[PDB]
């Protein structure tokens, strides 16, 4: 069961739509209920590889989104659309592996530094 107080910031018509999953789902699916998360706000950032680098004139496109807990709750960073950067620490799905993004994050770091780890990772 979806915690209730995840319903109290919610759209009335998400609400229904949420708990028609929790209750009927269609077949084949089940609602994840540790997954529900309101007021996320999110931006994408355009990044350019570097000169010198095995990534020198690719396009690239960051999305950050943020938790209604961030800074507290690291910031969830990935490389998005049709240009995913090809590197060992990154997923086909534009998942980052990078710790500053997990076990080393703090609120004391910044989406700046995220950007810089970032960089730094593709030379
Ligand atoms: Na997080």
Same mark, same amino acid.
């Given at each position: *069961?979806?915690?209730?107080?995840? =319903?109290?910031?919610?759209?009335?018509?998400?609400?229904?739509?949420?708990?028609?999953? &929790?209750?009927?789902?269609?077949?084949? =699916?089940?609602?994840?209920?540790? #997954? @529900? &998360?309101?007021?996320?706000?999110?931006?994408?950032?355009? =990044?350019?590889?570097?000169?010198?680098?095995? /990534?020198?004139?690719?396009? $690239?496109?960051?999305? $950050?989104?943020? #938790?209604?807990? /961030?800074? $507290?709750?690291?910031? &969830?960073? =990935? $490389?998005?659309?049709?240009?995913?950067?090809? !590197?060992? !620490?990154? /997923?086909?799905?534009?998942?980052?592996?990078?710790?500053?993004?997990?076990?080393?994050?703090?609120?004391? *770091?910044? @989406?700046?530094?995220?950007?810089?780890?970032?960089?730094?990772?593709?030379?």
């Amino acid at each position: *069961l979806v915690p209730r107080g995840s =319903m109290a910031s919610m759209q009335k018509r998400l609400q229904k739509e949420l708990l028609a999953l &929790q209750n009927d789902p269609p077949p084949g =699916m089940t609602l994840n209920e540790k #997954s @529900v &998360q309101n007021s996320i706000t999110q931006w994408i950032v355009d =990044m350019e590889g570097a000169p010198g680098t095995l /990534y020198e004139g690719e396009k $690239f496109q960051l999305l $950050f989104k943020f #938790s209604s807990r /961030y800074p $507290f709750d690291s910031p &969830q960073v =990935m $490389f998005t659309g049709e240009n995913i950067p090809v !590197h060992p !620490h990154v /997923y086909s799905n534009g998942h980052i592996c990078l710790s500053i993004l997990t076990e080393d994050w703090s609120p004391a *770091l910044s @989406v700046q530094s995220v950007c810089l780890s970032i960089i730094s990772m593709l030379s």
